[PDB]
Structure 1
Amino acid sequence: DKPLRKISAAFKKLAIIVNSPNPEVPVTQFSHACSLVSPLFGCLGIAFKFAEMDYVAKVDDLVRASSSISTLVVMMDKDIEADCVRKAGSHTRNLLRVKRGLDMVKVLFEQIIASEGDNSLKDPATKSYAQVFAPHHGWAIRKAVSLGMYALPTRAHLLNMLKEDEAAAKIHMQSYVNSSAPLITYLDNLFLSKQLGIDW
């Protein structure tokens, strides 16, 4: 029905949790919310094919795994205990990848809002990619992304795909931006407070 509204509702709930006394983020709830974001990358077209493995598959890995994990803290603590944080396919490694996707969407939305009046998505898509993902991508991937930018949908077409007009889309995009920001900071802090780094 209204995919942007399902996204804003899910992330509002996560923001409430992270801002609540003694916050506990359930892995099932978190992974499900992240899955609502997955189809946005496909909407943007071939420039963002990388996100299929870099984000969507990683979300799906966490959803699958979530049946046996309670909270993000517990999940990460078990990886620290086993000393497998940076191992391929670890819950915590996949979490870091998912966090980056949420952040790219946050910047994408911020930039769409900031460029209101522009009919193109090229600058918002380019700026969000270059800030969030380019630093983690090899040159050949970066080149491929730049070539796919011509195939972005028009801004109007994206809103059509999301079943919203400009006014409503602005409201729900801004909502996602407001909710995701504290969540992303909460996630970064899980890593930084345990000296794990976030740039790997």
Structure 2
Amino acid sequence: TGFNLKVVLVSFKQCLDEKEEVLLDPYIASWKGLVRFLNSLGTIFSFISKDVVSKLRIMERLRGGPQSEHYRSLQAMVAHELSNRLVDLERRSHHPESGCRTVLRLHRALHWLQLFLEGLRTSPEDARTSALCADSYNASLAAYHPWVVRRAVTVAFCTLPTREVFLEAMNVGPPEQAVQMLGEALPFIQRVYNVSQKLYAEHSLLDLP
């Protein structure tokens, strides 16, 4: 029953080393956990997250390929792809699937997840899970999606259960306990997101095609 979300959220701890580099292996591992979380929410969430599975595979290929060492961290990846002109900076052509542009999309998606869970964490007892999901989507990831894609994604929101059931489905006790867990574990995702955001901002990569 439900999903062991705490393990996945806490795994984001492993994504940052002492130098605050975002390590790609744990990043991919944590994201695979998030995909299993999404799968547990139902077929529509599996459907809309196919994009994320595809991008994780792209990153696994790069990390297993000849230049694997250069994808050890997002920092190493950026240095390697920029200096070797392996990133399409203006229009997608010769490197439509660079690690840089690919991780960018994973990162934007991560923001939705963290905003959704944080809204959930602080929600009143009467809040609807569907509204928390839509609101966090439209605040965040929707900005990068064409209106028609937003409509397709939105189909998913009404399939979510009540707040109580959704919280209990995290397998850590009643809603107030699940709330405690999110308070503990969310900071791990937020730190990874912030470090990643600043890295991309620093190199003017936030709008890669």
Q: For the superposition of Structure 1 and Structure 2, which TM-score range results when normalised by the shorter chain?
A: 0.7 to 0.9
Instruction: Report how many residues are paired.
Output: 195
Paired residues of 1:100 and 1:133 also in contact (CA < 8 A): yes
Is the partner of 1:108 in helix, strand or coil?
Answer: helix
More helix by share: 1
Q: Structure 1, unaligned stretches of length 5 or more? A: none
Quick one: distance in 2 between partners of 1:71 and 1:101? 19
Q: Structure 2, unaligned stretches of length 5 or more? A: 89-94
- In the TM superposition, what is the alpha-carbon distance from 1:95 to its structure 2 partner? 0.7
* Root mean square deviation of aligned Cα: 2.5
Paired residues of 1:191 and 1:198 also in contact (CA < 8 A): no
Cα deviation 1:131-187 (Å, max 9, x = unaligned): 222111111111223333222233333335432322332233223321222211110
Quick one: distance in 2 between partners of 1:59 and 1:38? 10
Other-structure match for 2:49: 51
Quick one: distance in 2 between partners of 1:63 and 1:159? 32
Q: Which amino acid aligns with 1:35?
A: K
Other-structure match for 2:107: 99
Quick one: distance in 2 between partners of 1:64 and 1:162? 32
Cα deviation 1:54-94 (Å, max 9, x = unaligned): x2321233234333232211111111023232432111111
TM-score by length of 2: 0.80
Cα deviation 1:27-72 (Å, max 9, x = unaligned): 112211121111233344426733221x232123323433323221
Q: Which amino acid aligns with 1:79?
A: E
Quick one: distance in 2 between partners of 1:48 and 1:129? 16
| Structure 1 residues 164 and 198: CA distance shift in structure 2, 3 A | farther
TM-score by length of 1: 0.83
| Structure 1 residues 115 and 48: CA distance shift in structure 2, 3 A | farther
Note the 1:1-200 alignment, pairs <5 A: 3-14=4-15, 17=17, 20=18, 22-45=19-42, 46=44, 49-53=47-51, 55-67=52-64, 68=68, 69-86=71-88, 87-118=95-126, 120-165=128-173, 166-198=175-207, 200=209
Sequence identity, in percent? 21
Larger radius of gyration: 2
Paired residues of 1:99 and 1:184 also in contact (CA < 8 A): yes
Paired residues of 1:35 and 1:60 also in contact (CA < 8 A): no
Cα deviation 1:114-145 (Å, max 9, x = unaligned): 21402620121011111222111111111223
| Structure 1 residues 196 and 148: CA distance shift in structure 2, 3 A | closer
